[PDB]
Amino acid sequence: EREKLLRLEEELHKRVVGQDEAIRAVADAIRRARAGLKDPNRPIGSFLFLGPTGVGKTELAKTLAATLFDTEEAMIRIDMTEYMEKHAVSRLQLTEAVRRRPYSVILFDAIEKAHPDVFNILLQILDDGRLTDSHGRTVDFRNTVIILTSNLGSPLILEGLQKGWPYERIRDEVFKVLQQHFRPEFLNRLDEIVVFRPLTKEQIRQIVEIQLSYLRARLAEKRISLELTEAAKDFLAERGYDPVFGARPLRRVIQRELETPLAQKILAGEVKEGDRVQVDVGPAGLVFAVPA
């Protein structure tokens, strides 16, 4: 645990690009949680992830589960934007998932969409780190990490970055908005209020690179090298990212624009063993060239 918790920030960055502030806060919170500096009757760490979409939020939550609990199976997701009905009853489900896996990351999507009812169960987790289910026998959450997402501050967060005003002025301005949708008890029991930032076209390109890494590695098994032009990477970065969908299409795009054609070349034999595949942009996609 010691070694792991120290190298936490590295491990998280192996899969999550940028968002350094987020990583630090979470890591420090978890480190501060262990070592016994916090009320034992609390989750390991509770967080409010604010900012844009498809920028790392879910990715960080995923990676955290894997890096901290050795597997992505340690993630429990609550797509709150769906629990708009008999919510309360449909979770005492939550208790059960936690009941069988005490060490687990619990992700609540769009937390503002939750009805006051949920916040009580939620708040009961943040305090005393325990929960009374339907039957009665309470579930221990002391070994869980709670991550809550929301876009409440997003537009103002963005605005603060364009006008480029001090981070403090952003966080404060953003916090005010939060004080209008969340009960202070809630915001006060949060270990951290993390703000994710705008996946600059750069971060997208950076994701293109880390995305390419698996392809390189998978190809390396055939001694095959894969060099891409900045233009090519930029193109993937372009087609890959979406304002509303985030960096989700990237995978599908890289698959279709690069992997699909590359595959035809290998089966055809154009790309042999050890070949240094050069990839550059064309009229409406990518072009491949084997050096002579």
Swiss-Prot record:
It comes from the Bacteria. Residues 199-292 are annotated as: C-terminal. ATP 2 binds at residues 51-58. Residues 1-198 are annotated as: NBD2. Changing residue 109 to N: Decrease in ATPase activity. It is found in: Cytoplasm. Homohexamer. The oligomerization is ATP-dependent. The Clp repeat (R) domain probably functions as a substrate-discriminating domain, recruiting aggregated proteins to the ClpB hexamer and/or stabilizing bound proteins. The NBD2 domain is responsible for oligomerization, whereas the NBD1 domain stabilizes the hexamer probably in an ATP-dependent manner. The movement of the coiled-coil domain is essential for ClpB ability to rescue proteins from an aggregated state, probably by pulling apart large aggregated proteins, which are bound between the coiled-coils motifs of adjacent ClpB subunits in the functional hexamer. Belongs to the ClpA/ClpB family. Part of a stress-induced multi-chaperone system, it is involved in the recovery of the cell from heat-induced damage, in cooperation with DnaK, DnaJ and GrpE. Acts before DnaK, in the processing of protein aggregates. Protein binding stimulates the ATPase activity; ATP hydrolysis unfolds the denatured protein aggregates, which probably helps expose new hydrophobic binding sites on the surface of ClpB-bound aggregates, contributing to the solubilization and refolding of denatured protein aggregates by DnaK. This is Chaperone protein ClpB. It comes from Thermus thermophilus (strain ATCC 27634 / DSM 579 / HB8). The gene is clpB. The chain holds residues 545 to 850 of 854 of the full protein.
